[PDB]
Amino acid sequence: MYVAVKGGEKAIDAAHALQESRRRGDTDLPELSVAQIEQQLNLAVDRVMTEGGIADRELAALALKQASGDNVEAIFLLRAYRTTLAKLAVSEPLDTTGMRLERRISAVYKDIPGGQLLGPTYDYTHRLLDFTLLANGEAPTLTTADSEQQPSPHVFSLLARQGLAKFEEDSGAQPDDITRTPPVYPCSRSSRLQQLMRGDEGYLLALAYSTQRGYGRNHPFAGEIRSGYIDVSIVPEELGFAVNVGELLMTECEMVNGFIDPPDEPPHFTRGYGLVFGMSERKAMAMALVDRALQAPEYGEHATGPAQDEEFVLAHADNVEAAGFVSHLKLPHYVDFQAELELLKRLQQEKNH
Amino acid sequence: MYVAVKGGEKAIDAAHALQESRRRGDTDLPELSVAQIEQQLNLAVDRVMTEGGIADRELAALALKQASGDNVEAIFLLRAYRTTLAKLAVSEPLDTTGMRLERRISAVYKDIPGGQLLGPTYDYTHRLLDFTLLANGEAPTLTTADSEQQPSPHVFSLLARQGLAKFEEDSGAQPDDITRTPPVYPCSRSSRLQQLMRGDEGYLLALAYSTQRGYGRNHPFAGEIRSGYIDVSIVPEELGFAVNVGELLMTECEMVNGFIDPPDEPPHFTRGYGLVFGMSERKAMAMALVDRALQAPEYGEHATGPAQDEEFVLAHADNVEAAGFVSHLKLPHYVDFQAELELLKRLQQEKNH
Amino acid sequence: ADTATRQHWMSVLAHSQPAELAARLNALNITADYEVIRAAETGLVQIQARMGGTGERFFAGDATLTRAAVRLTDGTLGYSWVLGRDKQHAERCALIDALMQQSRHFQNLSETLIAPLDADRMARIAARQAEVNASRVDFFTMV
Amino acid sequence: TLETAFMLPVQDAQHSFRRLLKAMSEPGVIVALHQLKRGWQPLNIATTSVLLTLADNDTPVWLSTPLNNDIVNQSLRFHTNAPLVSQPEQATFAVTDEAISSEQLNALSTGTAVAPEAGATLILQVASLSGGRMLRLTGAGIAEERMIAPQLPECILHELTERPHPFPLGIDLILTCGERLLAIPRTTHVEVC
Amino acid sequence: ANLSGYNFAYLDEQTKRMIRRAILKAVAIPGYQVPFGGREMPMPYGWGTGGIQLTASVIGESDVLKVIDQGADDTTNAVSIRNFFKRVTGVNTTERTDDATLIQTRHRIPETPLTEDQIIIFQVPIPEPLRFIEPRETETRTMHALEEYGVMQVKLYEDIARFGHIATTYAYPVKVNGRYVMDPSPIPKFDNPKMDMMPALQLFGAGREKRIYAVPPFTRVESLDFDDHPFTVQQWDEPCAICGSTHSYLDEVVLDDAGNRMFVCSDTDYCRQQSEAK
Amino acid sequence: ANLSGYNFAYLDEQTKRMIRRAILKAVAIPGYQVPFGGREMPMPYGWGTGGIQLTASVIGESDVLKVIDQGADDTTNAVSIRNFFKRVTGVNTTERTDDATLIQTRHRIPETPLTEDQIIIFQVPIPEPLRFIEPRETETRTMHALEEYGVMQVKLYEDIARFGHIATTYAYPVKVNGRYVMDPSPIPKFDNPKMDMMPALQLFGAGREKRIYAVPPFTRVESLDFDDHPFTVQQWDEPCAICGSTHSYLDEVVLDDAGNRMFVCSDTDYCRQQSEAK
Amino acid sequence: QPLLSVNNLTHLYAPGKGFSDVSFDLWPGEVLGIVGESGSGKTTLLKSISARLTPQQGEIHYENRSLYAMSEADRRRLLRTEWGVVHQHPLDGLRRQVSAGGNIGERLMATGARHYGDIRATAQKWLEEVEIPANRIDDLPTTFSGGMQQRLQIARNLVTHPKLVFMDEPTGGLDVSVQARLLDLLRGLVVELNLAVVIVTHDLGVARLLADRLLVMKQGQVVESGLTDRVLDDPHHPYTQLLVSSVL
Ligand SMILES: Nc1ncnc2c1ncn2[C@@H]1O[C@H](COP(=O)(O)OP(=O)(O)OP(=O)(O)O)[C@@H](O)[C@H]1O
Ligand SMILES: O=P(O)(O)OC[C@H]1O[C@@H]2OP(=O)(O)O[C@@H]2[C@@H]1O
Ligand SMILES: O=P(O)(O)OC[C@H]1O[C@@H]2OP(=O)(O)O[C@@H]2[C@@H]1O
Ligand SMILES: [Mg+2]
Ligand SMILES: [Zn+2]
Ligand SMILES: [Zn+2]
Ligand SMILES: [Zn+2]
Ligand SMILES: [Zn+2]
């Protein structure tokens, strides 16, 4: 006859060892360092920080190394680590006007006060595989202009001064924190922005692309994309006054969106907002576009695309949840499958009878 | 007065140099090699191969290095390189039954012929950030079992022999090639599978997750997920007989999906199929789930979710197109913006009058 | 008969690691005069897969493929089609394919080059399968 | 045994395409294709240049019996790899002479209302482009009017004047004489003077 | 003991306290899905995070923890969860349902009847029984609130009309305390009767969906059905090939490509109990 | 000359031939979007791939190439495209519209009138003028096929009713040869009249959307409008601050945060031509 | 020649569901009413004869041209310029997102109208002719009542003065006064503009006042035909007798 044996634990251990060996790869090659990943794979690090929820470059690079480059797994690792960390303080609201700029562009005006700073970007590069990277090379010597940073007013402040757009006013409303309470639909714009920042880059990019193609269009222009170092300050209870704890490299995107004609005020442009850690800006642009799409209830817009369906967009945006639930099908399901089979086998017999 | 000056070219060159320097990062750290990325960041390489369209690990790793870890940029680099390569042959149809397995699991039966081979996987790992990776470590010594590979019949072949599922029959239909002709909606299943394989992992994962949550459900079970080395063969014209040109590491996912009761045949399970390069399997699972969702016209299913909307899913699936069009907002748009402004200023002056 | 043997040795060469094949060929010190008919060209092989593994064909991407053609002094044409982008490896494979069609080289290289390469690959495969099979989940044993 | 194609395939194809584009975008304008010294007899220089510039494996080519020759077929297969079809209805490019019939002409694919580009292009070899019945062309590509008198079969003349196939359906006609080429797309309004 | 460097049961005291309040609210409102601020666990969402959180919030040093997946203690994920709990709590573990004080289960209720002071914690993918009928929470929350379960009855009626039977074979909806329609987690219909008037506390945790719900001991749990289509549990023409039981839920094990198969108890502990008794 | 290692114009001969056939079909069917098997370019989709492909397919060694974006030759993307074409073709380049044989443009038609034998190639994001009304191609293809443009007229009527004006300011739809409603690319309403009965061939390339369409020389291009709401081009109260032209499309340059701004010609070549003439 | 000739027309979803072997003729200036028990196939026949449903058998000629032998573009042009179609559900022949003025003016612009002011004036006039106020021109039909929506769909399909108008229960949801106002309008258009009407209705009074000829359908079969007065006052088929007796 047959006897049951124990195989689960040793199979798990062997699978983990196989995965670890594959992660290490050929031992003749030196092992990758987290510092190298942080410096040279910086855009993957940016995505992992933004979606995992921690703006720590070293931790994101460590997650990428541990995940064998899998962005989804690295993001989940970072989020799981976040769960284990005590919250020591809440930052004072970020002031992007104080950003030390690495890159500042505007698509709405040819030239603006402070100028079109391209900065480090792949924009306008010819995407031809550079095989010289197969061997060690020499970094280029950077050209140096004047060291001063020109006044860079937000382009939306220039639009609002003309009455073409509305200033984003602060009413003192307490932001919703979906990390402490589960989202409740319909969600406030603060909750929506928080979720979108954590959302999958590809999903939101596809939704924004659909909006550009008529599936809930909002006539977007890149009013300004700002990347740079923004100082973080906290008001500790031990002192009672603001202390600057450091600076974070972040990218801010502001989108002008189709004008509206309210009954009691002059017609004006609408807007969307995106904010991400690091330099990767397409996530911020997609965030702004989907934010504007989800603003439909405020503007009484008739939804014409899934990007405007708040529950559908947000419930499936977090790739932690989505990847986990899709991968869970790999778990043993033979009890449930036996139930489905038990029924199907009876339906076959009855149909044949 | 003002005189125009030339600044575009030098700004572009300086921006590219800045990006290249940032990619190199701190020079005290050794420059990353493509071999290291291929070996140790293998899952990112898998995604880049699958979406960029070339099953060349070295090229995908080179694109990742060149893209500073940006998966979207690396994928586009690989696709652009694909454009420059002559097509030398068309492979004979892949035979996954001949796969040399690294991993073979089935969620529908506790144990199957050939067994549950977990292989290298992160499944069942505790996602705790491993800080020992911050320093160099020693790879574990792998346990060794018997060297023979047990007969591994496809689980769907076991289901079809019982009449619970239908064999996938070949009618000799010529596959559609969306790389040679633009997709025409509604697309054939061959075209749909080709597009999904190239589609964004996050977008398709979100769509599949939505289907699991009732947005066009198809009651999925992971009938079998197979990863391993599959031989590629071609029939060159110089010889006229099949020649084996090598092996490719690929992952195949087969999903059992909700049974149907056709009027003239016994009720049976439906199915979905996914196939990817490398080991990353969640892409294959999402591909299978979205394939089943897009099979709605064949089964006369009433769409209940966007995942079943073929045009919406496919037109926005390719992150080359989506990322390009979202990022294009960064391009100067001041001519178009001046047009929108010229009108708004008039509709502001006619409302006030 | 002969076609199967040629297919076998071509598959062995294609599946061989370029380094080991080059080392083995250098050790054999084969003196052969050949003309390159087609320079080693790197391109793409379009991958055809099947729905459900057995059904209708669909295009599952592409893989890099390198091809080379040589002609020996006696008019023997050697060919190679190998995945990847190694032009020198493709040229060596085509040269060996041409040589193996000659009586004075077939049995010699079948025993000193093709068999030792196939055996080494088989050993690598067996070792990897031994490592992988440790991850098999044991459920029941017949008593 | 096979005829020779362009000496400089890239540049010659580009120049021939530019001449054909000039002819098609400006209907009635005669353009000379000088890149090919001799045609594939009985095919003339212009017809051979057009086929070499546009024909490939994706474009089936039908040759009428008067112009169908074993040497021509082998040369086309070798240089373009264009499939050769025996029926005009299967042809993306149709090559005929003055002996074309009303049946072959109407068998040519005219495209569909949703895919008007799925039709055929007719390369008609004419005795001359000057000595025929006077024709007045008006429409896209023509400022006010153009006068051309190609020697045309009656079926081709009837197709141009009456346009039985409503726009966007219809064939685009290419008249070839030696190295000289004239083009009349389906849009051109053709009147008999 | 716990010697892993984490807090006992890996949860911070604030998260434990919030989950405990949610558990009490769920007990006071049987069948109602109580939202809770679930945190990301070392296990991926959809791999038992809700059950892990519930166990961590309830578990103590003196508890004996039993973890089963598909009814088996040796299942991969059950092994992973049990090892995690051993690492971060050090509690005693058992494979015997009788000796367990806490049972965390995925898709099976043990064959051995549960007793007083035992808590069984279910892992739930979809806490909303009406989700597959109405995917949107905005509607199902109100349907629960206004006791509008007409969409489920229509679904059952249409399933009978189309097939002659109710298509749902697992995660079969059950009315709790005569009011709340509840998803019992993806346990088979075979196990649903065990829920009725059970002498053990039943806790249900959906970590990804951020819901917790519970059934107190000795609470009425009635599977939705019709008088002429009464609730019928899965049945097999064969007994277990190892212990010979005809009363246990059976899993089909395929032995070869030739179609030879054997049916064996999914509840491995019950199988051992029967086999030893002979 | 070309010394980059790629084929002349970077396109393989098969792709060039397919695009050439598409161009001829588009010329024979003015206004119709001809699908073509566009390839991925070294530039991202949405950054001018269609125009790059068209230029590569038409360009020759003897052509003089002019590339302008927003009407300016020095614009970033225009510089990138021109440098790519110089690298892979070696053709002569010019900033003077008069001296150009091929003009690849993004969002502007040059102020200088075009002449015979000139080809102007437009870069098109959305080749379908009805897309923003009907996002699905499955419907717009049939709307084109059956000349059902009733949805556009209704859109214009509703725009007038809501605002008193037609909201569309750029990419303004135009009827071509009296039959096909066409998107002229995101050029402003200012440039649309230049399209009517032009003596130069107009080619439109949407690489991402895989469409090519064309307007032959001397073809009727009529912007959709009403008699009582006639097509009116953009107007400014100021002339160009550099050359003083009142007839050129103007771009607004913001000089400071205090709101000081100056309007200057977008067509930089025309601006230079006017300034030199004084 | 008849304006619309139908010969052996048939379209059945299943035996007894639809219509079969239906033939008749319609000349300009006369109205052909159709009556029968609910589900008799009147709507299916109306859709088939209005180029909205390809018949399984039979033929339809319009001005000596087979209706379904022409290209889809020609049929669309006919339905767009010179053919009105009032649907049983008012919203079917309306655009929800488009105002009433836009709904009426779409048909005018399809006929060549390109003056916004004249289109708006005609829309206001017709809104008033069908008893809807002019100030509702800018309002969407979703905010209208069922009768208002039906009277908007009549105005939309009569603004272009089509030659042939197909109607399915046009009077449903209309009060008696506006019903008679809409019957008088149709009579005026028919006598003056020589308009032809094919109307499906259950209110026999409307058919008597409007329909010149009448058809009776039962189980998808045309049982009775001829003049409206003769059919109503001197019925022959038993079902026609029952229907006339049921008159309140
Ligand atoms: N798609 C369909 N499938 C099956 N049967 C259908 C379908 N559409 C209509 N039928 C049936 O065909 C018959 C004709 O219906 P139809 O709508 O033409 O009736 P009618 O006489 O116009 O109705 P009424 O006057 O009550 O509005 C009815 O039995 C209807 O149920
Ligand atoms: O959301 P979580 O993390 O608490 O996972 C709960 C359940 O969801 C998945 O689906 P499943 O029922 O097949 O089993 C898995 C898991 O036990
Ligand atoms: O699809 P492609 O690659 O050919 O890009 C065509 C056009 O699409 C984008 O939108 P744009 O009009 O603002 O300018 C960009 C670009 O020129
Ligand atoms: Mg009806
Ligand atoms: Zn599951
Ligand atoms: Zn744009
Ligand atoms: Zn047992
Ligand atoms: Zn100027």
Residue numbers in the entry:
A (entry chain C), B (entry chain G): 1 to 353
C (entry chain E): 3 to 145
D (entry chain F): 2 to 194
E (entry chain D), F (entry chain H): 2 to 279
G (entry chain J): 3 to 250
Paper quotes:
In Escherichia coli, the 14-cistron phn operon encoding carbon-phosphorus lyase allows for utilisation of phosphorus from a wide range of stable phosphonate compounds containing a C-P bond. The crystal structure of a core enzyme complex, Phn(GHIJ)2, revealed a symmetrical hetero-octamer consisting of a compact, central tetramer of the PhnI and PhnG subunits each interacting individually with the more distal PhnJ and PhnH subunits. Here, we show using single-particle cryogenic electron microscopy that PhnJ mediates binding of a double dimer of the ATP-binding cassette proteins, PhnK and PhnL, to the core complex. ATP hydrolysis induces drastic structural remodelling leading to opening of the core complex and reconfiguration of a metal-binding and putative active site located at the interface between the PhnI and PhnJ subunits.
In both structures, the density for PhnK is significantly poorer than in the stable PhnL-bound state, suggesting it is more flexible and possibly therefore that PhnL acts to stabilise the closed conformation of PhnK. In one of these conformations (closed, 2.0 Å, 81,605 particles, C2 symmetry), the PhnK dimer is in the closed ATP-bound state and resembles that found in the Phn(GHIJKL)2 structures while the density for PhnL is absent. Inspection of the active site reveals clear density for both ATP and Mg2+ suggesting that this is a pre-hydrolytic ATP-bound state. In the closed state, both PhnI subunits and one PhnJ subunit interact tightly to form a Zn2+-binding site located at the interface of the three proteins (the His site). In addition to two histidine residues originating from PhnI (His328, His333), the Zn2+ ion is coordinated by three water molecules and an oxygen from an unknown ligand, which was also observed previously by X-ray crystallography, in an octahedral arrangement (closed). Based on inspection of the EM density we were able to model the ligand as 5-phospho-α-D-ribose-1,2-cyclic-phosphate (PRcP). The ligand is tightly bound at this site with specific interactions between the ribose moiety and PhnJ Arg107 and Gln124, contacts between the 5′ phosphate and a loop (residues 47–50) in PhnJ and finally between two oxygen atoms of the 1,2-cyclic phosphate, PhnJ His108, and Zn2+. Presumably, the inaccessible nature of the metal binding site between PhnI and PhnJ prevents ligand dissociation in the closed state.
